Amino acid sequence: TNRSTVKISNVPQTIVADELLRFLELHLGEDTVFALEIPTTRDNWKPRDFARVQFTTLEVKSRAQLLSSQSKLLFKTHNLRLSEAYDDIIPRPVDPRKRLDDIVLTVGFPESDEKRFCALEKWDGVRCWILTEKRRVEFWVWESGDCYKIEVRFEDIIETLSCCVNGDASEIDAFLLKLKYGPKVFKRVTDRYRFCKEDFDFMWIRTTDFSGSKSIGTSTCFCLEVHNGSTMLDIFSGLPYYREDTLSLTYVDGKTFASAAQIVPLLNAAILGLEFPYEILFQLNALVHAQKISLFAASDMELIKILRGMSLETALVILKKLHQQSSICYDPVFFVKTQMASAYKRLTEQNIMSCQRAYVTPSKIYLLGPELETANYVVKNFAEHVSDFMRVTFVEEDWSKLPANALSVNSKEGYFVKPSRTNIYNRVLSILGEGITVGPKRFEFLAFSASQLRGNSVWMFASNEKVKAEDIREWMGCFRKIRSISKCAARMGQLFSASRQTLIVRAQDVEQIPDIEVTTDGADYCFSDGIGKISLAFAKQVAQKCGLSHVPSAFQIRYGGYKGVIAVDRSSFRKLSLRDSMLKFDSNNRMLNVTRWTESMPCFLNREIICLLSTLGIEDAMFEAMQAVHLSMLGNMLEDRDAALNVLQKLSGENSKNLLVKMLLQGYAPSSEPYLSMMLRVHHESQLSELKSRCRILVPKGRILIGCMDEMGILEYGQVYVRVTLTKAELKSRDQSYFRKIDEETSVVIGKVVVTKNPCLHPGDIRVLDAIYEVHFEEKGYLDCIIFPQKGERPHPNECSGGDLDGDQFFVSWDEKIIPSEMDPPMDYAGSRPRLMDHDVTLEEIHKFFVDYMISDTLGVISTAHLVHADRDPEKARSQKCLELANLHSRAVDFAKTGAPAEMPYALKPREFPDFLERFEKPTYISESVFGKLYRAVKSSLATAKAHRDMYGEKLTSLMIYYGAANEEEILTGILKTKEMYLARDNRRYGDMKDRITLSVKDLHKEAMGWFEKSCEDEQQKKKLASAWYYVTYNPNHRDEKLTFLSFPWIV
RNA sequence: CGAGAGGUACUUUUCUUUUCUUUCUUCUUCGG
RNA sequence: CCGA
């Protein structure tokens, strides 16, 4: 009953569409058929055995279905059989009243504090199709001959009104729409088996704004002027968030805001003066980009004259309160009347940097503000022009990922197909080339990081008087010796990691050791991928600024364009020594910084891990017990204190000294202590949710740690040594079969482990590596580093999908329940041929590589198609459709390195999803594999003091509404109970705000210690004043009418 | 009996399923 | 947000 398009099962193949049209109009009524389409295998001379017919109403569709079920449709000795189609031939609503024809559409925004409306442009004679089934509305705006489809979804509309232009309340002739996001703009571009009854033989492509004055990009409010709205109120009541009230308006003249730049929603800084500060104007413009202050409410002189002469802190704390409230403030003058050093010091201690984040849509721009992000190397060596850095990302109108059809649309012209670049392509290229111009500044393309390329983000810098965009680029190094287009861009994002700086090593302290390599059977291999050597004391001097008591044996390090780990030798003689396979460019700096050193974090059992280990003769029955042993201590965590220590000592951090571990041993029951009872309940809800969503079966006998190679020569092909550290449960039973307590903290292994990587798809990635013991290996002090053999045939890191040794993880486990004795041969490791140019990079090929990284990026579908093609097909991970996908994954993960795309073919998509997915829109099917059993196994389980308190309250309650958190536990833990529209489809963008709220509340915990030491410096007398802080949050008599917080006094 | 002319006489003699693809715009995976 |  949703659609009227009917698919006929058996039509004759000797007919034309007119013969079927006349037959259907002879049996049914006259001209009751809207669309008719017979698909052809060839171009125009080979029709197929079925056809699609779309009727005008539902009654004639039901009558045709009743005639077909009674066998009364005989067309040339063929009984027609009707069924249901997949979609409409033309996206047209089947309603005679919803198709509003020849109406007036005008755009604008409320100008003054009242409910007025200023019009920029006016469109006369447009269409209006309200698609209830597809949950969108579309307009057809004709301009200069061609038309432009403007698609507006239902989720973008937040307020539907009923206005009146003519003044009379009974003459309802206007409908005001309030759009949170922007609309999708389309364009019409320019025979025998299609009748179609109208002019619909064209195609829609996503282009930029069509108006010469560019009014649509600053048109967050709409006004649908209808001819006569009397019975249309029953149709407009189906719109979401429809306020059932009649309200008048005033049509203000608004042709003043007429810009010609690509960045439309910006205030004219030349009119208000170039002497305005950037810190206030950027926040005032970001409030305009949000749905709090309109354009005319901020561009008036009564707001600039009252905000120009003031201090910069006082004018910012009253502008942050405008973003604090969720109500749309119509009069900003009335709010600021009721509203009335450390930043440079706080960057080198906790890597706190406030960067201006932007979101570029195909229509407008969305500036957010100086958000707290992790400071990298470049902004820490450039801590004087922090207001010139900007993170720019290219997203959709609803802040989602840009697909491959919004730009570079394919069109078969001539003999072969050719991709056609639309107006979004030339817009993103113009933005990357020229730049954006907000305030008295202009942001130029600096570079982009390795993860910025996958997330479609880029770094931008403004050329000031001191430095420029070229000087900061040549300060990193010289990139003229790289003749590639992808590698020259990838080496400019190498020096952008989230690191902590250390002392500078001079240029005289270099020692180049000649490397080692093996060439077996014509295949080139190497053992010194990114490894190096370091001394005993140098680890102490590099750990003196990080606070590491336990000396790590291997840690990833970077300086001067070199990348990889370094190992500790006990026969060291110099301070620093380097290999030759670290050089990427000839830099001119040698400042040292460390990203992440070493951590003995226990592992989990991922989906591809089960997919690759349920093939080698290991049974599927133990995978349910491996999660049953976890849920037996996870389920009774809410009502017991014994399982609460075991489910927190190794779940999130092994030696994790946090607030949940100090009150775990010397603590009470979870019935009392609500500060413990809240976070433990939300950790239980997190542990069930991230187990139901993805496979995260925890095992205590396995770890995850960074590996390195050692210069000993004893280790051979097939034998390593694992000197793991003893956890809180490893010291309870030292006498084990495969484990051996060599010391108190160091618990070595004597069994056999499996070593793989985090992405793995080929069955040759599984390899058995026996842990042996030697006195020369135990005397070298290889703590928290799985060492690798020096010689052999090929290196064992390279056996795990061609992995190098440059600061990457390794999944290891010495469990003895599996049967890994069956072994498969490995796959190839050499990628595609590199592409070298005959000239130098002119800084436009990097723009082309960044824009063409969005298209032809099928990395998101290969791991999905492999996981479904291993569920639906027996002899999984060994069929040909698994080997082609395993080759395409290794070709697609090198797309950031070399410029060779993946090109995911057709007849390989599954078109059917298993049970263990969150895709509730696809026609799914019940999975019979072990993954469906593991998905059902969790469904079987789920069946003086007052001033400080009041200032902590107002310092904490703002970021809940600012981030979208409804409670304190959503923002103080990391995981929010509610999700947004674009965050429900992007895990990487969800992790951004997940880390960003923790990095935000870290500074709140810093100022909670700062105010505590500002109140009293004595520690022995602080326990008597902390009792009052506990009593005002525990006792109900000291609780005021506001919602007080219980996580306030728990600072230590 | 040899030469020159015209005539009967190789006719399809090996094409392969006739069911082969357009219902399209869709979550990379891991750890801080 | 960052590193395979």
Ligand SMILES: [Mg+2]
């Ligand atoms: Mg690596």
